[PDB]
């Protein structure tokens, strides 16, 4: 680089450690606030992890309701029989491979269909992951193999593929390390959302825009000033008709003011057994002379040419100590922000990040631990690592930041990264616009620290790369150990894998709907029917045990009545 470049870097390094200081002690008293708030609300109440089977179903079809595969499916008797068949074909070793290569061999086979197909084999495959890993080693040694003699760059390796056997990997690990969530990592996890959730709601957060005052994220940080006051309400519990304080803010729209009141008065139950703050009417006990109730709409909503304002608590002048009870029930909206980085908003990010460090620095440390608070490592970690170990000294790659990168793009960059911005695939609970954002900045943050990459700081570098420069090459060295200390563990003995995947097929043989997962499989069967059919009777050890006759009589049967 130029003397310019390293006297601008070094300036900018000290401009940041400038506003650090500004708010280092203020951070660790906002921390030891929000750790309290944290083990109230928390410390004596259940975390709400998901059963197995709906986590496994959220990650594996993401934003995909009721999905066929946790339900019943009624279907004709010669479509079950022709089913079953199909299922056994899964079960062939020279079938599968086949099949799915000659899926991604199509043109018309989108990324997308990529990601179902893996995710709807794996579910198929469930009840039988000891097959499956063998499979899954295979489709990953092809694909390795195919790219390294495409003569492609081995770090770029599992990066850009987004092949199908990457992607059912992901889902294998999604599969296998639901019990490190449930003992490990889903504590730190859980904790980092609470903490998150909690901050925001310290300040004013816009329901219209989305941005809030302590945003972690630059985008959706509050550009205005927004003058607030903290209320306390007393809300009628569902019980006696007894009643429990919750705190709120003046600017809240009512509907935020009713999710703050869910939260507080259904403390112990899992969200999605809550009433909705849409099904209820916040009404106001000034009484019993008066109950009146609030919304974010009625008669008295402000009207300014064309703006239309969210109702707030401050629109009704709602008062500190009031009464308050949840019953059963061309133009701009605009709440807090109405439109037609600064020191001071960088001081107030490095704020929230710093009230929030050591909630992300628990939930790192765990997800790169080999040996916590008494566990041990996963296995089907142990076991992937060695496998793209194995991989790479195949070729004699002694290069460290190959497997290194392997590692990486295998696992914490698609596994764990997903459930850190999407903590509700793994507990029963609403992840609203601003803690998303939030948590999309400790992602990035994440991803950075995985990688062999040189962090390069500038002006024009995002926020998180700036916010947390000096965390990072902490964190890739935690990283880097937790390869290295992988490595020198002993190897699973085959037997062992084996034994531990038949007890993890036999735990959850009948979660999924098997039948629902072959039926939607089979879609691509007869989308893809004559090349696939084309592929059986070519390669050698399809003919060996005539797979090709064995999908025709299926194709047939599935049409007879």
Not at 267 to 290: F, V
Not at 409 to 429: S, T, Y
Not at 524 to 533: A, D, F, G, P, S
């Amino acid at each position: 680089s130029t003397q310019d470049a390293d006297r601008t870097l070094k300036r900018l390094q000290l401009q940041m450690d400038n506003l650090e200081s500004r708010v280092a002690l203020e951070c660790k008293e906002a921390f030891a606030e929000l750790q309290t708030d944290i083990n109230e609300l928390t410390n004596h109440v259940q975390i709400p992890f998901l059963d197995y089977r709906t986590y496994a179903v959220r990650v594996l079809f993401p934003g995909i309701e009721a999905h066929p595969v946790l339900k019943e499916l009624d279907t004709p008797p010669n479509v079950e029989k022709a089913l079953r068949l199909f299922g056994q074909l899964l079960h062939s070793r020279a079938f599968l491979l086949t099949f799915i290569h000659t899926l991604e061999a199509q043109s018309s086979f989108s990324m997308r269909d990529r990601g179902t197909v893996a995710s709807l084999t794996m579910v198929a495959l469930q009840s039988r992951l000891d097959y499956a890993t063998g499979l899954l080693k295979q489709l990953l040694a092809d694909l390795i193999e195919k790219n390294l003699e495409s003569k492609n760059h081995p770090k770029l390796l599992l990066r850009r593929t987004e092949s199908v056997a990457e992607k059912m990997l992901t889902n294998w690990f999604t599969f296998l390390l639901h019990k490190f969530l449930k003992e490990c990592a889903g504590e730190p996890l859980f904790l980092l959302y609470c903490a998150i959730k909690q901050q925001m709601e310290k300040g004013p957060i816009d329901a219209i825009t989305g941005e809030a005052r302590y945003s972690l994220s630059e985008d959706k940080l509050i550009r205005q000033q927004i003058d607030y006051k903290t209320l306390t309400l007393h809300c009628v519990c569902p019980e006696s008709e007894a009643q429990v304080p919750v705190k709120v803010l003046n600017c809240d729209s009512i509907t935020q003011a009713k999710d703050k009141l869910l939260d507080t008065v259904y403390k112990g139950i899992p969200y999605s057994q809550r009433p909705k703050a849409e099904d209820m009417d916040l009404e106001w006990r000034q009484g019993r002379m008066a109950r009146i109730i609030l919304q974010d709409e009625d008669i008295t909503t402000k009207i300014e040419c064309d703006w239309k304002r969210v109702n707030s608590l401050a629109h009704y002048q709602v008062t500190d100590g009031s009464l308050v009870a949840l019953v059963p029930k061309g133009t701009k909206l605009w709440h807090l922000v109405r439109n037609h980085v600064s020191e001071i908003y960088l001081t107030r990010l490095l704020a929230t990040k710093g009230t929030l460090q050591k909630f992300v620095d628990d939930l790192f440390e765990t997800v790169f631990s080999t040996a916590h608070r008494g566990s041990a490592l996963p296995l089907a970690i142990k076991y992937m690592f060695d496998f793209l170990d194995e991989q790479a000294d195949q070729r004699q790659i002694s290069d460290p930041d190959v497997r290194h990168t392997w590692k990486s793009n295998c696992l914490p960059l698609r596994f764990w990264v997903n459930v850190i911005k999407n903590p509700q695939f793994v507990f029963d609970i609403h992840k609203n616009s601003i803690t998303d954002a939030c948590l999309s900045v400790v992602a990035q943050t994440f991803m950075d620290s995985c990688s062999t990459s040189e962090h390069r700081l500038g002006k024009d570098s995002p926020s998180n790369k700036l916010l947390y420069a000096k965390d990072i090459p902490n964190y890739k060295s935690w990283v880097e150990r937790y390869y290295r200390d992988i490595a020198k563990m002993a190897s699973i003995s085959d037997q062992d894998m084996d034994a531990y995947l038949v007890e993890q097929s036999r735990l959850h043989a009948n979660d999924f709907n098997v039948l629902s997962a072959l039926s939607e499989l089979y879609f691509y069967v007869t989308k893809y029917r004559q090349e696939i059919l084309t592929s059986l009777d070519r390669d050698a050890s399809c003919r060996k045990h005539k797979l090709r006759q064995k999908l025709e009589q299926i194709i047939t049967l599935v049409s007879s009545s």
